[PDB]
């Protein structure tokens, strides 16, 4: 009769999520649907090699597609054709070269999209696979939502901390009023 | 400064086979405990097995810690801090990425309840109380040793 172990679930890892993401891309071919601990351990040794290939692919894609086509991904409000031929045709029609059109495109980019676009910074070199990962894939890095809801932990960062809540003891009486209430100490009026 | 070594939660790399070894140790401990209730083994035999099977597992995890770091994540921030000899040793790293093992009550005896979790995974309430014996022993013996 199988025994409950608390180790029956494989630990969520960064390697497993990336390895599964690379499996569907075709960059890697795993033995089965789920990456084994041997494959995840092997992934750590060669993790940098696969990241560089994705980075090289993006540089090759940028070289071929062009600045307009490549960076249009982070400008949603840009509906014009971003192809190399379209950009050249637009320059012939209007005289605005590729750089002028490129500045025009980024004029419509929102600040939220710009921060996302910073993953393409030549210094940061963020992983192209990580930039386009869906939320459902990201959660598997730590293994989905916590069983204990975080809403229990959440507290607004402006709270007077009501001391009459269910988790607080009864209000502490003033010491020279609990004694007076229990008639242990007579008031000065009684004394005089 | 330029390289800027820095450790994160996932930098505390654990041996891949820890889950298997701990699960195997639990199965042996559970089967033996069941037969101890049946009367097929006596209390001392259970006591020795509990201490030894968890100590051997802890030592094996410590033994396999460096080759795993060398073969898989040579530039792991936690590995480089200890392997280069800059700060910390294997034992202290083992407390973070392996398992704290068995502590000792202030009489020299071994506490039969092991600490299967490390500091990254976090100790349970009972495991943390047990680990307070080692902390109390360490601080007290430090005063004795220096004086």
């Amino acid at each position: 009769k199988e025994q409950w172990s608390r180790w029956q679930r494989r630990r969520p890892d960064v390697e497993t999520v990336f390895l599964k993401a690379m499996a569907e891309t075709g960059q890697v071919k795993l033995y089965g649907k789920e990456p084994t601990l041997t494959e995840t351990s092997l992934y750590r040794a060669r993790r940098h090699l696969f990241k560089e290939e994705r980075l090289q692919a993006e540089r090759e894609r940028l070289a071929k597609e062009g600045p307009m086509a490549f960076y249009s991904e982070w400008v949603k409000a840009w509906k014009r054709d971003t192809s190399r031929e379209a950009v050249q045709k637009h320059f012939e029609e209007t005289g605005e070269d590729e750089n002028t059109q490129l500045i025009e495109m980024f004029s419509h980019q929102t600040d939220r999209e710009y921060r996302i676009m910073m993953g393409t910074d030549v210094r940061i070199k963020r992983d192209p696979l990580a930039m386009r990962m869906k939320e459902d894939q990201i959660k598997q890095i730590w293994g989905g939502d916590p069983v204990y809801p975080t809403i229990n932990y959440i507290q607004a960062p402006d709270a007077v901390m009501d001391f009459r809540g269910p988790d607080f003891h009864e209000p502490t009486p003033n010491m020279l009023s609990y004694l007076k209430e229990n008639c242990k100490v007579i008031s000065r009026e009684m004394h005089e | 400064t330029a390289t800027s070594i820095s450790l994160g939660i996932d930098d505390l790399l654990t041996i891949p086979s820890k889950g298997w070894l701990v699960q195997d140790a639990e199965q042996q401990s559970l089967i033996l405990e069941k037969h101890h209730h049946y009367g097929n083994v006596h209390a001392v035999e259970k006591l020795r097995q509990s201490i030894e099977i968890w100590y051997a597992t802890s030592e094996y995890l410590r033994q396999e810690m460096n080759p795993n770091f060398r073969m898989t994540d040579p530039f792991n921030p936690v590995h480089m801090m200890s392997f280069s000899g800059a700060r910390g040793n294997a034992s202290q790293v083992h407390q973070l990425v392996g398992m704290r093992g068995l502590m000792s009550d202030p009489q020299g005896q071994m506490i039969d309840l092991p600490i299967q979790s490390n500091l990254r995974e976090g100790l349970s309430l009972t495991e943390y109380i047990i680990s307070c014996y080692g902390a109390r022993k360490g601080v007290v013996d430090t005063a004795v040793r220096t004086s």
Binding site: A45, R46, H48, L49, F50, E53 | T1, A2, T3, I5, P74, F75, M80, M81, S84, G85, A86, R87
Partner: peptide, 29 residues
């Protein structure tokens, strides 16, 4: 000691440097 260790931690070698089995700049000084 960490900084010196990083300096002398040289190139990645073997399978950690190339994805596939092969089957670099020259500096005068």
């Amino acid at each position: 000691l960490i900084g010196l260790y990083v300096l002398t931690s040289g190139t990645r070698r073997g399978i950690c440097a190339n994805r596939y089995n092969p089957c670099e700049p020259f500096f005068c000084n």
